[PDB]
């Protein structure tokens, strides 16, 4: 408070998290949604607004069309993005952006112009003194405590695995897959139609996402678990809807996350995450693979399915040579780990040299971010 | 362009008669020849180093004539007797001259405890031996060499009188002999001790030659006095020869030398509190939410709901292992369109055709 | 594994074997995951020695 502390903002497709530099915990975590009313409103003299933003939007789900501003990790509606950032700065943190620097995170492989846009609407409108952009998955490795290893980050919008050697990333070995939690929610909604239950609107998609977060797990063996569900009815759970109805999902608990390992269910050509990180390792040099097998770190919201670590280790050990040792690293707070890495990066004294000055931006236009940020 | 050859070569031979300690001794002598060539002390064909395998059976190993020291393998050497006759023909198909072995045989007839005899013809050693005064203790290596003997050499040891004159001049317990105008001979109980003495004498002789040439006379040398100087356990030359065999093995050379103290290579790891622990311990499926059970007629087959109160199975799986199983594989595309035309143009021609009739109506007619 | 030892001069065996071993075995093996274990100042001095 005596000195200006930077703002660490982690912004993915699913939720937005914001906090102060050097803090243990982010101050605000809220879904990245902008809702607009659809029904006729006749109640004059009481509270109506033309648009709802943040957790207030998810509170009044029954009278809105929920609309995600970030699609597959790419910003597609910039006005809603500015509204999200305004609600982040003023409603939640309640600090003006002009006093403090801000730090943003972004996907590894992306359209170029997005970064330019993230520059232009951050200096021109919010009048920040300085900012910086960092790759999301590097911060997971920084927060885990390791300078060398391969990290998979599978958020709600995009999945990507990057190998980092001696704290300094390799661009040619970066693998990006467009398969994340939202596609899993859509697949779960599609396969829940076969039992009779129907979910079609946006609030129903939020309810289905809640069902997925509550009752899903990854089977160690798909065939054995499927035969087990074919034998008895011990794999049945009952979830109570906000209407008051009770549904019994049963067999679908381990079929929804299995699309992560077998993307042929969705019809996509690309194969599962385990062989994806195997190919990412194989694209690197032979000498560094020994450190890469022993330092595999999982991160992101989708990687919080129960039993994901054992299945991942078994598959990647089946793919790996027999003489090599496999170690998976699953932090218990992996869902926030990227933000934690940001808090590490905003506290280093050398990082004061990294900041893009406002004068430098005014001199060089919005293209300063490619040469300044790596 | 890959001049290296495997020193061991016992794998390729598969022949001849060898004792239990013959393999180690042959590998040791060939490694010694390789080291003499690789230091650059000796380069051409001669009989420099000789070994005794058995104390009570003679059978000394010498090098065949006409082979360079780089080309020496273990199987190519020749085992002979004390007199010098070829009791065992070597693997190399070269003419055998056993003339220079005679001096080594005379030294073998002198001492029973000697097993390794090394002769040097390096320029510095020959310059020291040609010098009138003896080797001066002007270096630490010369002090570490120890005592020595000086014998005038006439170049031939065939005569019996020369052999019997060598024996008393050599002494009962002496390790270093100097043949005047011919070089130096080192005697060792083990091969490594003889190699150590050879290396120390070799270094000391260039030290003495350089210091003696630069200083001028003996007065400026201020030489020291030798008298004032005066696992299990190591034996003089074990560690150095072991290190040389280790590095030579790391070149890719196959040496039969086994190690009294083997080497352990561990990277190890430092535990850091910041590091988080590891903490570890085709077909398409169609689901059916229900299960039907066969029930006898109460003949006609009947199937039963089997609801969830009766603990029935939850999910029935159907597996499809290949695409397009619904359609037969072999089919002409023209047939369907032909039949579509056939059906459709009966509307165009507006037939008077009625549906099939059952045969119970046909019987009464 | 065919280390491909360099040819040597008649008086230059030491130099050739030294550069062959330099080609085979690097002198800075601490790079990788092991670089964290040693101190930053100490590792550089170890490399120099």
């Amino acid at each position: 408070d005596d000195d200006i502390a930077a703002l660490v903002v982690d912004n993915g497709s699913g939720m937005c998290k914001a906090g102060f530099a050097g803090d243990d915990a982010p101050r605000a975590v809220f879904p990245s949604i902008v809702g607009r009313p659809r029904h006729q409103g006749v109640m004059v003299g009481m509270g109506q607004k033309d648009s709802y933003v943040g957790d207030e939007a998810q509170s009044k789900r029954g009278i809105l069309t929920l609309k995600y501003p970030i699609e597959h990790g790419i910003v597609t509606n910039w006005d809603d993005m500015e509204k999200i950032w305004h609600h982040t700065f003023y409603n939640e943190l309640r600090v003006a952006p002009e006093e403090h620097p801000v730090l943003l995170t972004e996907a590894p492989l992306n359209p170029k112009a997005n970064r330019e846009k993230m520059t232009q609407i951050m200096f021109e409108t919010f009048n920040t003194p300085a900012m910086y952009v960092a790759i999301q998955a590097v911060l997971s490795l920084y927060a885990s405590g390791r300078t060398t290893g391969i990290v998979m980050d599978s958020g709600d919008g995009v999945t990507h695995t990057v190998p980092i050697y001696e704290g300094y990333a390799l661009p040619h070995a970066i693998l990006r897959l467009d398969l994340a939690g939202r596609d899993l929610t859509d697949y779960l909604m599609k396969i829940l139609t076969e039992r009779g239950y129907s979910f079609t609107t946006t609030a129903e998609r939020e309810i289905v996402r809640d069902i997925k977060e509550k009752l899903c797990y990854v089977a160690l063996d798909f065939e054995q678990e499927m035969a087990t569900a074919a034998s008895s009815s011990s794999l049945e759970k009952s979830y109570e809807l906000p209407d008051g109805q009770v549904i019994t999902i049963g067999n679908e608990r381990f079929r929804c996350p299995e699309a992560l390992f077998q993307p042929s269910f969705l019809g996509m050509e690309s194969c599962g995450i385990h062989e994806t990180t195997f190919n990412s390792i194989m694209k690197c040099d032979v000498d560094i693979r020994k450190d890469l097998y022993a330092n595999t770190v999982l991160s992101g919201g989708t990687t919080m399915y129960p039993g994901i670590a054992d299945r991942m280790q078994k598959e990647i050990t089946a793919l790996a040579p027999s003489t090599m040792k496999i170690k998976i690293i699953a932090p218990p707070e992996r869902k926030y780990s990227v933000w934690i890495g940001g808090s590490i990066l905003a506290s280093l004294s050398t990082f004061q040299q990294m900041w893009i000055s406002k004068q430098e931006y005014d001199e060089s236009g919005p293209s300063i971010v490619h040469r300044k940020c790596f | 362009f890959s001049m290296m050859t495997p020193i061991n070569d016992l794998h390729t031979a598969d022949s001849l008669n060898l004792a239990k300690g013959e393999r180690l001794m042959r590998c040791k002598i060939s490694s010694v020849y390789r080291l003499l060539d690789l230091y650059g002390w000796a380069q051409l064909s001669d009989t420099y180093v000789t070994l005794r395998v058995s104390k009570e059976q003679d059978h000394f190993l010498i090098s065949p004539k006409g082979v360079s020291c780089s080309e020496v393998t273990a199987s190519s050497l020749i085992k002979v007797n004390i007199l010098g006759e070829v009791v065992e023909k070597g693997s190399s198909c070269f003419p055998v001259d056993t003339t220079g072995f005679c001096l080594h045989s005379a030294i073998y007839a002198a001492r029973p405890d000697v097993r390794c005899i090394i002769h040097l013809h390096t320029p510095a050693t020959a310059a020291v031996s040609a010098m009138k005064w003896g080797l001066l203790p002007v270096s630490h290596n010369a002090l570490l060499v120890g005592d020595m003997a000086y014998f005038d050499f006439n170049g031939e040891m065939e005569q019996e009188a020369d052999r019997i004159n060598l024996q008393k001049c050599l002494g009962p317990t002496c390790k270093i002999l100097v043949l005047r105008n011919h070089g130096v001979v080192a005697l060792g109980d083990t091969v490594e001790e003889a190699f150590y003495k050879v290396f120390h004498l070799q270094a000391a002789c260039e030290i003495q030659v350089s210091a003696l040439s630069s200083a001028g006379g003996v007065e400026n040398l201020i030489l020291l006095e030798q008298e004032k100087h005066r696992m299990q356990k190591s034996r003089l030359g074990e560690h150095e020869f072991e290190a040389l065999m280790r590095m030579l093995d790391n070149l890719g050379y196959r040496t039969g030398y086994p190690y009294r103290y083997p080497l352990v290579q561990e990277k190890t790891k430092h535990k850091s509190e910041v590091e988080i622990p590891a903490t570890v311990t085709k077909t398409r499926w169609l689901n059916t939410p229900n299960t039907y059970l066969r029930v006898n007629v109460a003949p006609k087959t009947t199937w039963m709901k089997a609801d969830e109160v009766e603990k029935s199975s939850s999910g029935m799986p159907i597996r499809i292992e290949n695409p397009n199983q619904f359609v037969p594989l072999y089919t002409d595309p023209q047939e369907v369109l032909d039949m579509r035309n056939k059906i459709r143009e009966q509307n165009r021609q507006d037939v008077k055709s009625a549906g099939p009739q059952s045969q119970l109506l046909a019987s009464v007619i | 594994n065919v280390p491909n030892v360099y040819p040597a001069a008649p008086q230059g065996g030491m130099a050739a074997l030294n550069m062959s071993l330099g080609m085979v075995t690097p002198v800075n093996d601490l790079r990788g995951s092991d670089s964290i274990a040693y101190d930053k100042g100490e590792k550089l001095l170890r490399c120099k020695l």
């Binding site: 920084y142 300078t147 704290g167 280093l348 050398t350 990082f351 990294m354 790596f374 | 850091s272 | 964290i36």
Partner: peptide, 18 residues
């Protein structure tokens, strides 16, 4: 140790980038 090791590492990204 880890903190000032990342200190140094960020120093060489400054050295290396431009």
């Amino acid at each position: 140790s880890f903190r000032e090791e990342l200190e140094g590492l960020i120093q060489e990204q400054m050295k290396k980038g431009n």
